Amino acid sequence: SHRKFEAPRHGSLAFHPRKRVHKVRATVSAFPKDNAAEKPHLTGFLGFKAGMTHVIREVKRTNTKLPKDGVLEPVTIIETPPMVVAGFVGYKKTTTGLKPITAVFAEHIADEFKRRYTKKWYKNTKNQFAVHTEKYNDVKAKSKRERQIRLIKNRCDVVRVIAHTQMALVPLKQKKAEVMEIQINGGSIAEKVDFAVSLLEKQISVNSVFGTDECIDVCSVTKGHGYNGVIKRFGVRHLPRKTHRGLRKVA
Amino acid sequence: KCRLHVNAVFMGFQRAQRNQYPNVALLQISGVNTKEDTPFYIGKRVAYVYKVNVKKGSNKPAIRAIFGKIVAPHGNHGVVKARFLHNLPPKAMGQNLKVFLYPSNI
Amino acid sequence: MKEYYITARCTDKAHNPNEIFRSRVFAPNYVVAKSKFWMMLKKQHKVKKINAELLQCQPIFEKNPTVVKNYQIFLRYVSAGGIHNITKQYRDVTRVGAVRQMYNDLASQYRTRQDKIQLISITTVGDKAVKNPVLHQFVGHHVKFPMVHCKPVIASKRFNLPIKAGKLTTKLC
Amino acid sequence: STNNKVTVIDCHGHVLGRVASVVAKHLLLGQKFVLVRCEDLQVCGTLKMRLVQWELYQRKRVNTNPTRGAFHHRSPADMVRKAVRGMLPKNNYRGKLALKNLKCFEGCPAPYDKMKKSSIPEAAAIYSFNPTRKRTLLGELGTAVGWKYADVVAKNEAERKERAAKWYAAKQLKQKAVAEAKEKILADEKYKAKVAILKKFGYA
Amino acid sequence: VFSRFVEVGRVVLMKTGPFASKLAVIVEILDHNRVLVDGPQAITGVPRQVVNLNTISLTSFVVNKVTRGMTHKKLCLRFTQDAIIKRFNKTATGKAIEKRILREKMTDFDKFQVSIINRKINAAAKIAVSKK
Amino acid sequence: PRLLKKTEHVVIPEGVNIEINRKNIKVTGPRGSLTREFQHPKVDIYASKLVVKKEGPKENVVVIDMWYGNRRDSAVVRTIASHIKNMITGVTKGYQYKMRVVYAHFPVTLVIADDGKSIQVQNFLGEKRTRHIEMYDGVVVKKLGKDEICLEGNDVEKVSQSAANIHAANLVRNKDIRQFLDGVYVSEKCLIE
RNA sequence: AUAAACAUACUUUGAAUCGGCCAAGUCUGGUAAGCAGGACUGGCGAUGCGGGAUGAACCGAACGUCGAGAUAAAGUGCCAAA
RNA sequence: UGUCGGCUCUUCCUAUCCAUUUCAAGCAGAAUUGAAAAAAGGUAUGAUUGUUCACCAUUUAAUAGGGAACGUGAGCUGGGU
RNA sequence: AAUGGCUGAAAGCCUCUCAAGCCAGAAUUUCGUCUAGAUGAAUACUUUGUCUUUUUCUUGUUACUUUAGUACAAUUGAAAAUUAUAUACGUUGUAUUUAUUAUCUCGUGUAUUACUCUAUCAAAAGGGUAGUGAAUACUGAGUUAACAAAUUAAAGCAUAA
């Protein structure tokens, strides 16, 4: 028999399975489409949600009935100290998807970046990138670095820099940095690698990535809530008071 | 040193849709594409030579073989019937068999 | 298909024992030809096997099976609607071959099995008496056509390999 | 003996199901197969006809859990693997081992582009098809149903042709010079004893 | 434009049957699938018979003044006038057929000599081509 | 029924050259060059000298022959011949499709870009929307007179389709089209020369 | 005419069973039914085997344990022998 | 094999009520009527009655028709039987 | 998609095509974007450099420890496209497994190689350059053969990450 009355289904099937992530940081699934007729630039950053407040803003849109004295709106503050570029990676378009070809790293790597490679820092030998730094200027290692640059300029289509935050600039108790790959969108692969090479060990501020009054996309992990019933997870209707064995379940 | 055999593939046992008779094995000799080229191989020797990884303390040979004869053709496509001293193991389906040039009639 | 010349006569009070019935029956073998012959006598002259006796049943061979002739076949076939008389034309060197063509043609074009067709007659027509729209184009003295998209011909089943080397090609032939 | 070599089938100008039937039989005969360019295979019917057939295939899906249901791979190499798997024994070790010897790739990858290629005369489209019967390439059908790597294969194939165009041009020059040097040896006065044997058996 | 046609007088080569690799002449076209070939029985040995077109191959020779239903007496006369046998033996197909007849009467010893000689000649011809 | 040989030909005039490479005909004339691929697997296109008049001399023709083939597949011999005939005419005396604007109350203003490769349709039936139909390569729009435009080109298929694009952009919706006779219609089709 | 001596004729004593169902170049009641009820025969029940992918009844053919051969129904692109 | 309805909830069919794209009219406009593509999204609140049904009062772009053991009782309720 | 059209035959005209070839057109489909996610890839450090199994230490992994056995650089596999394919030829008529004249020694140089190795320039190349060896041709000669014989197992825990 048909359901007597029609109603929209509770919850979205676009978000099933409904499973909690493991890492706190959320990797962006995609980057803006590349355009080859513009100067190279970075297409992303990384910040920490400080909190919310509210503002009053003057309305500049015309033909609107909003008050001329301003409208109260909520805002979210995202603290974004400058990030440090530690290296870059080239990607190649294969018949199975993007494949990283090689990764080139800077000479000096901060201890915040190194902590990402262990699970117990205080019990570690803390020798991450030690061989890479020790023989950085060796003639054999210099030629390998140049070949890596040349290989990317020939057999790569996507260039991303490896940038990490400086956790000493935020009140977070964490000391291990958060690492993100920021894709370079711009000219050819030759001038994209040149842009990334000049960015090694430099600091990139959030103003160099985002402009003024720019609409952007934000990717993050929602606040955890633990085990929950069907009333909160989906929003189904509660059962009558007369119900045996409980009210907050799908009948 | 030299090649004095022809690779024949152990296609399977003489069978029907749902039954199977392991007394006769069906071989597909290399280079024989029709039943009219089969009369040469009727009566020839066929060996299924297989390797067994024996232990050092064992006197069993590392290389063993099962010998048989080609007795009749099977269809119009050069497949033959062979009978062996012991029925071939069905784990050897698709493996290669040696078809020798003896008993010679030339 | 084969030809047979069959003669017989009836010896009973209804048929005089001087009337001889002849036919030229097409059949795969002489047993089938006799059966076709006896159905005609029963269905036309009330002559039955028990009351009659066969005289001759001998094969008929083409005098010159090397000259191409235009055969005109008159036949009747039973369909769902009823019974129709049809005239078909075939080109061949033997009478039996043309009749074999007719049976295969009727079974495909009209979906009519063998046991629904009766071959009334088969004669030889002239060059310009061919009316088949397709067959008429090969009757002239200057028929010429290039056979294209040829598949290469294998000499025998010996050289018929399942997987070959290199690329495959057709032939302008 | 043992067959350690790989039979490389160029799936260009072939029919999907007729290639699969021959390969699936030989996979059961112990042969190792690689079907390069499994996206250039042809199937009967226009694109509109093929897309309708795909929609019927895409409908088959477990109602209570689509993740358990039939998985409809769009890659042409996976289209062929589905066809070949259907012609092999099901749920036994014999059919699993046979399918372990088969590979398609959408182009010609690094090891298989310099190997000897084979053809299946039974599966050639020029033999089994009326020329006016409209066909569809597996690649063209794959793009229409959501195969994202159609232009990656085209780019990789374009590089492969231009590299083979100069390898063949260079090799032709060597073979022409070798053939001439062979003609001077064959016509040489001192080689008469050897050449006489060659001509007597039709080799010269 | 097509160069070889199925017509009366066209010399065809039988590919299968008891008369494979024997020359023949088309004398009458039955229909699109069948022709009558009478490659002179007194010369090539192929009797006047009806053959499907799938079992022959056209050659580049057409006998002049060959008409429909040409008799074997006159066909033999015109067959030897154009010297079809002489001309066919100089073609790639003519030499391919002759080679196969030569090879099929080679014993083991004869194949041994050719492999030894051909290997040396081919290797020697490779040495004679400089690499600069 | 099947035809043993269905044949057609087109006559190459004095100042026209044609090269055929696997059913890829490239006709060159005084007014430019034209190329088209005829991907039918059963036609044979080649150039030859044939007598087309009952008593005239040989003149160069392009012969399109199709041998044994049913009536469904034999219909492309004349189709290909007519396409080649149109391509010959388009490079000697190019095609021209003249169009006229019909309106009852609201005048329609046509804005043609300087290059002529696009047109603008404004105030069609008083609508605020503006149509900016573009044209195919080799098709040029110019305004002849009041409420009249024409398209010039060497390819009839592109000139006619561009004309169809202009008309199809000005269709009356949700109204009686027998009463609202508004739009841009092809008055007549002719040759430039 | 043909067949029939481990033929033929039986005698005594006794078991189980008398819910049946199916097919169809058959029939009746019914609009009809995988419905109800019949005439003749063959079946299933009581029966496995080869085939029809699967199936009480269809087709071939009825069964001690086996070897080698010709076969029946029906098949011969792969699964699957051809 | 827990025997009606309602509450709850998911999914499916199209013989489509609305929204999207089209054609026809005895289509001037507006409002409508017949039909094609299309089942991805929607299809309500109440008085009386256990009611399915029914009939009224509204609101809506529309308040379409049905299936899933006449969906759904170790899911409820127990008004009907 | 329905539909409306262009060019255009069949069928000298006509025709949106129960023909070839195209265009416009949906809350449509596919990419793009969102969520989950398989085999994977890159880099950092620890190693290892012909190979495994059985024991054994550790929360566990890897390296590691011991007794053996085993192999030893050198000819390995590519036209593309079309198929009514410019002309000509039809080059016929056996894909893989499976194309080396037994072994060793003696004799001099040249030449060749999708051959091996080293150095260098390069490089997600069957790459270039130089050198070296191997195989082969020019192109030899000699010795010998008779019976025989011609793939991993089993045990440990010192140190290090």
UniProtKB/TrEMBL annotation, chain A:
Top-rank lineage group of the source organism: Eukaryota
Part of the intact protein present: 2 to 252 of 402
Protein name: 60S ribosomal protein L3, putative
Coiled-coil region list: none
Originating species: Entamoeba histolytica (strain ATCC 30459 / HM-1:IMSS / ABRM)
Gene Ontology cellular component list: cytosolic large ribosomal subunit
GO MF annotation terms: RNA binding; structural constituent of ribosome
Annotated keywords: Ribonucleoprotein, Ribosomal protein
Family of this protein: Belongs to the universal ribosomal protein uL3 family.
Residue intervals passing through the bilayer: none
Signal sequence region: none
Keyword Ion transport: no
GO biological processes: translation
Keyword check for Mitochondrion: no
TrEMBL record, chain B:
Signal sequence, start to end: none
Molecular function as annotated in GO: structural constituent of ribosome
GO CC annotations, alphabetized: cytosolic large ribosomal subunit
Transmembrane region(s): none
Keyword Ribonucleoprotein assigned: yes
HAMAP family linked to this entry: Ribosomal_eL33
Record family assignment: Belongs to the eukaryotic ribosomal protein eL33 family.
PANTHER family, sorted: 60S RIBOSOMAL PROTEIN L35A
Protein name: 60S ribosomal protein L35a, putative
Source organism of this protein record: Entamoeba histolytica (strain ATCC 30459 / HM-1:IMSS / ABRM)
Automatic annotation (TrEMBL), chain C:
Keyword terms, alphabetized: Ribonucleoprotein, Ribosomal protein
InterPro entries for this protein: Ribosomal_eL20, Ribosomal_eL20_dom, Ribosomal_eL20_eukaryotes
GO biological process, one term: cytoplasmic translation
Entry's Gene Ontology molecular function annotations: structural constituent of ribosome
Domain Large ribosomal subunit protein eL20: from-to ranges: 1-122
GO cellular component: cytosolic large ribosomal subunit
Pfam families, per the entry: Ribosomal_L18A (PF01775)
Annotated SUPFAM superfamilies: RplX-like
Record flagged with keyword Ribosomal protein: yes
Family: Belongs to the eukaryotic ribosomal protein eL20 family.
Name of this protein: 60S ribosomal protein L18a
Protein species of origin: Entamoeba histolytica (strain ATCC 30459 / HM-1:IMSS / ABRM)
Organism phylogeny: Eukaryota, Amoebozoa, Evosea, Archamoebae, Mastigamoebida
UniProtKB/TrEMBL annotation, chain F:
Recorded GO CC terms: cytosolic large ribosomal subunit
Residue intervals of the Large ribosomal subunit protein uL6 alpha-beta domain: 12-94, 117-183
InterPro entries per the UniProt record, alphabetical: Ribosomal_uL6-like, Ribosomal_uL6-like_a/b-dom_sf, Ribosomal_uL6_a/b-dom
Any Gene Ontology biological process: cytoplasmic translation
Domain of life: Eukaryota
Keywords: Ribonucleoprotein, Ribosomal protein
One MF term in the entry's GO annotations: structural constituent of ribosome
One Pfam family recorded for the sequence: Ribosomal_L6
Cross-referenced NCBIfam families: PRK05518.1 (NF004037)
Family note: Belongs to the universal ribosomal protein uL6 family.
Name used for this protein in its record: 60S ribosomal protein L9, putative
High-level lineage: Eukaryota, Amoebozoa, Evosea, Archamoebae, Mastigamoebida
